[PDB]
Scaffold this motif. Structure first.
Motif, PDB file in Angstrom:
ATOM      1  N   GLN A 177     -13.141  -7.101   5.165  1.00 54.68           N
ATOM      2  CA  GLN A 177     -13.856  -5.888   4.819  1.00 54.68           C
ATOM      3  C   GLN A 177     -13.480  -5.396   3.434  1.00 54.68           C
ATOM      4  OE1 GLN A 177     -14.288  -2.932   7.523  1.00 54.68           O
ATOM      5  NE2 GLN A 177     -15.134  -4.206   9.233  1.00 54.68           N
ATOM      6  N   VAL A 178     -12.306  -5.788   3.006  1.00 48.24           N
ATOM      7  CA  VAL A 178     -11.889  -5.374   1.710  1.00 48.24           C
ATOM      8  C   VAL A 178     -12.598  -6.240   0.682  1.00 48.24           C
ATOM      9  CG1 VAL A 178      -9.836  -5.195   0.173  1.00 48.24           C
ATOM     10  CG2 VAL A 178      -9.872  -4.061   2.379  1.00 48.24           C
ATOM     11  N   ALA A 179     -12.482  -7.560   0.817  1.00 46.19           N
ATOM     12  CA  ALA A 179     -13.118  -8.509  -0.108  1.00 46.19           C
ATOM     13  C   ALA A 179     -14.602  -8.260  -0.302  1.00 46.19           C
ATOM     14  CB  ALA A 179     -13.014  -9.950   0.415  1.00 46.19           C
ATOM     15  N   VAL A 180     -15.164  -7.430   0.561  1.00 51.02           N
ATOM     16  CA  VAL A 180     -16.593  -7.180   0.538  1.00 51.02           C
ATOM     17  C   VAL A 180     -16.921  -5.731   0.188  1.00 51.02           C
ATOM     18  CG1 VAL A 180     -17.985  -6.872   2.793  1.00 51.02           C
ATOM     19  CG2 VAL A 180     -17.485  -9.202   1.807  1.00 51.02           C
ATOM     20  N   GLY A 181     -15.858  -5.040  -0.223  1.00 47.34           N
ATOM     21  CA  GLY A 181     -15.929  -3.652  -0.623  1.00 47.34           C
ATOM     22  C   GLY A 181     -16.126  -2.698   0.530  1.00 47.34           C
ATOM     23  N   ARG A 182     -15.893  -3.154   1.750  1.00 50.95           N
ATOM     24  CA  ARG A 182     -16.100  -2.234   2.842  1.00 50.95           C
ATOM     25  C   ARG A 182     -14.882  -1.324   3.026  1.00 50.95           C
ATOM     26  NH1 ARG A 182     -18.602  -5.397   7.890  1.00 50.95           N
ATOM     27  NH2 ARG A 182     -18.293  -3.391   8.944  1.00 50.95           N
ATOM     28  N   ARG A 183     -13.780  -1.773   2.440  1.00 50.84           N
ATOM     29  CA  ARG A 183     -12.510  -1.082   2.458  1.00 50.84           C
ATOM     30  C   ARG A 183     -11.999  -1.092   1.037  1.00 50.84           C
ATOM     31  NH1 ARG A 183     -13.524   1.558   7.152  1.00 50.84           N
ATOM     32  NH2 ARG A 183     -14.657  -0.041   8.353  1.00 50.84           N
ATOM     33  N   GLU A 184     -11.466   0.046   0.630  1.00 54.72           N
ATOM     34  CA  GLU A 184     -10.953   0.103  -0.721  1.00 54.72           C
ATOM     35  C   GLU A 184      -9.810  -0.848  -0.964  1.00 54.72           C
ATOM     36  OE1 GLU A 184      -8.581   3.401  -1.887  1.00 54.72           O
ATOM     37  OE2 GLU A 184      -8.213   2.397  -3.878  1.00 54.72           O
ATOM     38  N   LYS A 185      -8.854  -0.773  -0.077  1.00 58.36           N
ATOM     39  CA  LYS A 185      -7.751  -1.678  -0.265  1.00 58.36           C
ATOM     40  C   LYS A 185      -7.198  -1.873   1.077  1.00 58.36           C
ATOM     41  CE  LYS A 185      -6.553  -0.795  -5.005  1.00 58.36           C
ATOM     42  NZ  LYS A 185      -7.731  -1.699  -5.032  1.00 58.36           N
ATOM     43  N   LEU A 186      -6.417  -2.966   1.151  1.00 59.76           N
ATOM     44  CA  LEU A 186      -5.702  -3.354   2.378  1.00 59.76           C
ATOM     45  C   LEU A 186      -4.221  -3.070   2.210  1.00 59.76           C
ATOM     46  CD1 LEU A 186      -4.805  -5.241   5.230  1.00 59.76           C
ATOM     47  CD2 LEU A 186      -3.998  -6.591   3.247  1.00 59.76           C
ATOM     48  N   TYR A 187      -3.666  -2.638   3.328  1.00 57.94           N
ATOM     49  CA  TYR A 187      -2.273  -2.341   3.277  1.00 57.94           C
ATOM     50  C   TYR A 187      -1.403  -3.294   4.068  1.00 57.94           C
ATOM     51  CZ  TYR A 187      -4.014   2.025   1.258  1.00 57.94           C
ATOM     52  OH  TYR A 187      -4.675   2.944   0.468  1.00 57.94           O
TER      53      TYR A 187
END
Ligand SMILES: NC(=O)c1ccc[n+]([C@@H]2O[C@H](COP(=O)([O-])OP(=O)(O)OC[C@H]3O[C@@H](n4cnc5c(N)ncnc54)[C@H](O)[C@@H]3O)[C@@H](O)[C@H]2O)c1
Ligand SMILES: NC(=O)c1ccc[n+]([C@@H]2O[C@H](COP(=O)([O-])OP(=O)(O)OC[C@H]3O[C@@H](n4cnc5c(N)ncnc54)[C@H](O)[C@@H]3O)[C@@H](O)[C@H]2O)c1
Ligand SMILES: O=c1ccn([C@@H]2O[C@H](COP(=O)(O)OP(=O)(O)O[C@H]3O[C@H](CO)[C@@H](O)[C@H](O)[C@H]3O)[C@@H](O)[C@H]2O)c(=O)[nH]1
Ligand SMILES: O=c1ccn([C@@H]2O[C@H](COP(=O)(O)OP(=O)(O)O[C@H]3O[C@H](CO)[C@@H](O)[C@H](O)[C@H]3O)[C@@H](O)[C@H]2O)c(=O)[nH]1
Ligand SMILES: OC[C@H]1O[C@@H](O)[C@H](O)[C@@H](O)[C@H]1O
Ligand SMILES: OC[C@H]1O[C@@H](O)[C@H](O)[C@@H](O)[C@H]1O
Ligand code: NA
Ligand code: NA
Ligand code: NA
Ligand code: NA
Lengths: 674, 674
Positions: free
Chosen positions: B211-221
């Motif tokens: 979801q991050v790599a696809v801009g669905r999430r700003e960043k992953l923690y």
């Protein structure tokens, strides 16, 4: 008063705990689906604890059904005993165990969550530990012994313990949970009134032994010495452990929460045999005939400040009492019950004793009423099919207990303890049958039903009549004991009354049964032959109030050559006959007085004879000329033994109807048929 | 064929397992309440596996609802994936976890017991082990590691494992249970068609990274190196592990039972970072940014004869494909669906693509029908509100896929492969539109819906048409791919057909949409202006069968000065126009042929223009003069590109409608509005 919801409260442990709860000031509501009990325990508890116990026949798995409880009462805490607990059977029908036990708990907890009830006491079990010997030095078993149940039943308890912990952990400030790991509860309340009534075949050492000593089982089979070990805890000590748990939760802040567990055991390991012997010793009989499971009780002692106080011997004696008094438990041949109001309303029942015999008596909680009397299969009294009829506003007081004061009170007023009282006037210018406070509409506690001997059945009801709720002064406790002797076809009624608070109250109870000895044939009492002990009667004025004088009525006495025959219209009676015209009535309790035969009634067409006897000084005789509410005139005749008319206002009769603090009112009435 | 009940089958693992099951010869029925999924996965599976998958939207806790499955199909085995599985959330809403997870299982098991279904494969989890490091040498984790979950979710799995064991133990010969402890499943089917679609916020390392790599999430923690350890197993390897488990159960006697557990993992521990890197490597992107939980996989390898065969790299690539192909998962803006038959009948839906735009296309599983086409908000085709209308016995074939053979077949007979066939005659003396085997009433698989690019939407349906079920020879597989281009307001229809068994079949599909370009105003097609590519048409006899000759019709062509205007009654057309009068039709697949503009239709009052194009050799033009079933004459006009009339019986046209084993029929139709 805090209201505790007791799930599985009609069962063994739950019932015993209710006693403790009520004794400790709590009010209880019981929810039980009766899968392994009958309502009878609850009915008995009402009397034993002198408190009404609202009861809901419901499966905890039925959310809608269970929600009603939460909607109906403000629950402060819940003690959850409900569940299936036969280890053996659990291995065989595991799905039912998990479904019943887990689903019941979850639903209950979800409603509590919803209703914001945070206090919960859970019936856990030492079964959660599994075999503690799998660890070294684990006997006696500490709370910290690792859990590892070995049967489905244990599994369900273990699951529930986790749900609780998990739930508390999820909202630490909204839940106060006490998990109680019971060991082997045995025994019965010392009164012998309640005990364990295994609906089927005792799985337990104890109940099984008891069933043997009573011939319910041919023999019992014995399955360090040889015998598997347990910690046998007296059910009363166990129950008290619940009160300790509740107080512990109660010590916590409204804003605080907790989850903790305690073993509830004696800490004493018992050798099966050791038990046997204790039992044989207790019962004075020789029955035929996991390793260990002893609790370490230190945590409870230190934290809950609780410990067992009874011995295995006490457990054995107590169980033996309950057993001897109720060899077959609560269910009795010759006793039947049915709903008299809404389905499942348990405190609204019609109970028949002497059922299926030549002398059947039906009583209702409402007015502790005599619903029916059947002699040789024939009903001899008037009554209604349900409570609705009894509740008619145009009551004729059919079959009811009359209280606190029977008959008329001049203008409804009286004075006592130099205080003046005014009762609601309902009959002419007077208050008749205590008007608004009439017992005929009050719901009594119980009953306690016994079959103490062949052909003998008893039903006992109780009434708590608080000053705050009536025009009379004082908090009165009343008990009614009915004794049905099938062999003699007799009904004995014993009234007892005592003030629990207050200096004094006027008191004068009676039973207002209306007889009709020729029901199969016949629209009236016409044809009945009557003879009374004497014609002497309380003279009255135009308002049915005593003039002070004593006159003769025109009626046959026992020595008359012919009896008085009641016709379709006349003669008509509505008077108070005096037993001994001489008597200076001084006694509040006539129970030890002679049982005087006062009326003989006979119907040649049915060939039935009725005799009424009483220890009371007077008796009202009334031909039902003013019969209403479903009946017509002269459809039954009443005979009400008691204490004059307006005695409370009559100089010479007032003391015998004045119950003072510390004393006990007593009165007896007997009906015998032949 | 063995029928496997797959609970939670619309979910992640369950969906992947269905692929494996169908590929291994099993038939599947899915039961899912869609609490953490949508029906879309199932619809896609139908196409991917080329099999219908009966689906029940049901909560396993609903006995009545779930029982229907058992009543409707003979279940041979059950794979139970259904459940709530967010560890984090479980700690917060524990009651829901226990209720949902435990109650669902118990109900399912009680029905199986009742229906005598003994084979069960359960989705367990490595969470049951808790922290294995609490023991020495417990990593990698053996099946024998003692259970001790540390979260409510684990607790529920642990409870279920005991219920199973307990249940088997209670009736050892009636139950065959495989408990599978999954580790960390990751990845997606390599086709990229199905994957994990976390309905909310990825709790998981993987889906969250994606979801991050696809801009669905700003960043992953990022929450031996520093990072908590796991055994990441490719969802496909996991799915195959279920087939291994089923076969193991299947090896056992009908009269025998068992209960056993297996860890399903790679045996390889992965460093969170290690993953990250694998992922970044896979996705070609730099995302922002219990101790151990590695399975010992020896038991499964030895007993189930199963082991993982894929790598974390493969898991990463596969997940990346599913992600890039479906960045937002199955739910798409511009796509909507509704029931077209009974509530909750998922294979009976009307799906709209291009929803809310200037070009909306609605399709039905039934007949892979074109339910509606809206241009600038205005519907331009005839249709019905539900399936009922399409199902009328007096069909006009409105909006349907026509198959296997469009138009007339002389006397219903034909020969092929030197064999003579007879089709049911339904139109005059001939079989029109394949009569009884008409695709218009057949229910297609799918659809697979995609939004591959801005303004572009696709819907793909499939049909399995077995010889055994039709008058035609051979087992035909058909696919229909619809492509909706909102920018261009165009609908492209691509047909493909292939024999899966049989030497050959006649084939000639088409779409029978009926247009009406002036719906807002107007009771007929009156006013429509028509021009066709050429007047050249298939000459026919009194029975609508070709004479062999080619004649001109009186109608405007694209070079005419005026168009043909359709009046309220005339002109009337029902003929086959030829694209190239010269052509010697030889091709079974025209997909690579030129997309020829064949008809131009325009309505001056709505100002809408329709152009139909096709790679097909001919086109039927019909003015709906015989319109029935809810419509009246001339309420819409049809344009059906295809292959002549009776081609199968015509010397010179037969080869182009003869699908032989090994080849692929192909045909394309385009509708463009302006
Ligand atoms: N007697 C023991 O030796 C023992 C030992 C330790 C733990 N326990 C537990 O203590 C509790 C009380 O045990 P007991 O000896 O009094 O048993 P019991 O059978 O006498 O009492 C349990 C009661 O729960 C009721 N019940 C069952 N399922 C219900 C449901 N779904 N909804 C409503 N009512 C339901 C039954 O009808 C019964 O009256 C149980 O939870 C039992 O597991 C008992
Ligand atoms: N994904 C993991 O990492 C993981 C690890 C091991 C064990 N598991 C277990 O594997 C199973 C499948 O997991 P998943 O990743 O596919 O999860 P998922 O959420 O994708 O699939 C579970 C499905 O069950 C359905 N469902 C939930 N409760 C239901 C009910 N009461 N009745 C009917 N359907 C219901 C949900 O809608 C969902 O489609 C679950 O039991 C999960 O606990 C998963
Ligand atoms: O018919 C019987 C039953 C039991 N025993 C023996 O006498 C003892 C009593 O057994 P029983 O009364 O059933 O006790 P337990 O089996 O120990 O189980 C109880 O004690 C558990 C904790 O120990 C509770 O938590 C459970 O609910 C309850 O079933 C044991 O040594 C038995 O072996 C007999 O000789 N005959
Ligand atoms: O947003 C996140 C989530 C996780 N991690 C880390 O990366 C790893 C992946 O964690 P996650 O994907 O959620 O796996 P697990 O927490 O190990 O739990 C899964 O693995 C269990 C067995 O290990 C299954 O049985 C459960 O259903 C499932 O939740 C761990 O090291 C996490 O600390 C992150 O850095 N960011
Ligand atoms: O219907 C009740 C009747 O009860 C009698 O006790 C009374 O003397 C009658 O006058 C009438 O009140
Ligand atoms: O209503 C269906 C119509 O379909 C056309 O393809 C055919 O040529 C017409 O004659 C009529 O059958
Ligand atoms: Na008794
Ligand atoms: Na009875
Ligand atoms: Na896509
Ligand atoms: Na959508």
């Amino acid at each position: 008063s805090k209201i505790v919801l007791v799930t599985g409260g009609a069962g063994y442990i739950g019932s015993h705990t209710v006693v403790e709860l009520i004794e400790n000031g709590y009010d209880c509501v019981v929810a039980d689906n009766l899968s392994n009990s009958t309502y009878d325990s609850v009915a008995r508890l009402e009397v034993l604890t002198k408190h009404h116990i609202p009861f809901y026949e419901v499966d905890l798995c039925d959310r809608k059904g269970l929600e009603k409880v939460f909607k109906e009462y403000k629950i402060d805490s819940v003690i959850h005993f409900a569940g299936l607990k036969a280890v053996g059977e659990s291995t065989q029908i595991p799905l039912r165990y998990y479904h019943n036990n887990i689903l019941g708990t979850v639903v209950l907890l979800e409603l509590m969550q919803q209703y914001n009830v945070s206090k919960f006491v859970f019936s856990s079990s030492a079964t959660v530990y599994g075999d503690a010997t799998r660890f070294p030095n684990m006997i006696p078993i500490p709370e910290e012994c690792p859990l590892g149940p070995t049967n489905p039943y244990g599994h369900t308890k273990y699951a529930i313990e986790n749900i609780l912990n998990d739930l508390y952990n999820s909202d630490k400030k909204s839940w106060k949970f006490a998990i109680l790991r019971y060991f082997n509860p045995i025994g019965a309340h010392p009164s012998g009134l309640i005990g364990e009534d295994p609906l089927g075949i005792p799985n337990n050492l104890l109940p099984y032994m008891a069933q043997v000593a009573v011939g319910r089982r041919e023999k019992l089979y014995i399955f360090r010495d040889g015998t598997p070990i347990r910690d046998y805890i007296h059910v009363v000590d166990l129950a008290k452990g619940h009160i300790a748990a509740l107080q512990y939760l109660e010590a916590y802040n409204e804003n605080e929460g907790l989850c903790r567990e305690w073993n509830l055991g004696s800490g004493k390991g018992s050798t099966v045999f050791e038990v046997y012997h204790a039992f044989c010793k207790a019962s004075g009989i020789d029955l035929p005939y996991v390793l260990n499971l002893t609790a370490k009780p230190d945590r409870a002692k230190r934290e809950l400040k609780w410990q067992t106080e009874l011995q295995v011997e006490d457990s054995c004696k107590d169980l033996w009492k309950w057993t001897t008094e109720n060899p077959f438990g609560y269910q009795l041949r010759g006793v039947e019950a049915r709903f008299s109001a809404e389905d499942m309303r348990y405190d609204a029942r019609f109970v028949t004793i002497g059922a299926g015999t030549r002398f059947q008596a039906t009583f209702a909680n409402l007015g502790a009423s005599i619903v029916d009397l059947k002699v040789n299969g024939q009903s001899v009294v008037l009554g209604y099919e349900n409570e609705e009829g009894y509740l008619n506003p145009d009551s004729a007081y059919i079959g009811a207990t009359i209280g606190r004061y029977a008959n008329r009170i001049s203008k409804g007023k009286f004075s006592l303890c130099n205080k003046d009282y005014q009762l609601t006037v309902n009959n002419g210018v007077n208050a008749n049958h205590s008007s608004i406070g009439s017992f005929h509409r009050k719901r009594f506690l119980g009953p306690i039903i016994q079959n103490p001997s062949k052909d003998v059945f008893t039903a006992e009801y109780m009434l708590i009549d608080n000053e705050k709720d009536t025009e009379f002064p004082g908090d009165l406790l009343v008990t009614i004991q009915y004794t049905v002797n099938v062999a003699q076809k007799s009904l004995e009624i014993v009234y007892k009354g005592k003030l629990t608070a207050g200096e004094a109250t006027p008191i004068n109870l009676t039973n207002h049964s209306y007889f009709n000895l020729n029901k199969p044939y016949g629209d009236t009492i016409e044809g009945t032959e009557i003879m009374v002990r004497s014609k002497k009667s309380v003279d009255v004025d135009k308002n049915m109030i005593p003039t002070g004088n004593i006159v003769d009525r025109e009626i046959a006495t026992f020595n008359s050559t012919k009896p008085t025959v009641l016709g379709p219209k006349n003669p008509q009676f509505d008077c108070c006959f005096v037993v001994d015209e001489n008597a200076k009535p001084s006694q509040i309790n006539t129970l030890n007085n002679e049982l005087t035969l006062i009326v003989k009634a006979f119907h040649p067409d049915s060939n039935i004879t009725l005799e009424v006897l009483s220890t009371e000084p007077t008796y009202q005789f009334y031909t039902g000329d003013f019969l209403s509410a479903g009946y017509e005139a002269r459809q039954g005749f009443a005979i009400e033994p008691g204490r004059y008319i307006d005695a409370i206002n009559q100089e010479n009769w007032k003391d015998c109807v004045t119950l003072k603090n510390g004393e006990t009112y007593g009165s007896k009435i007997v009906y015998r048929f032949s």
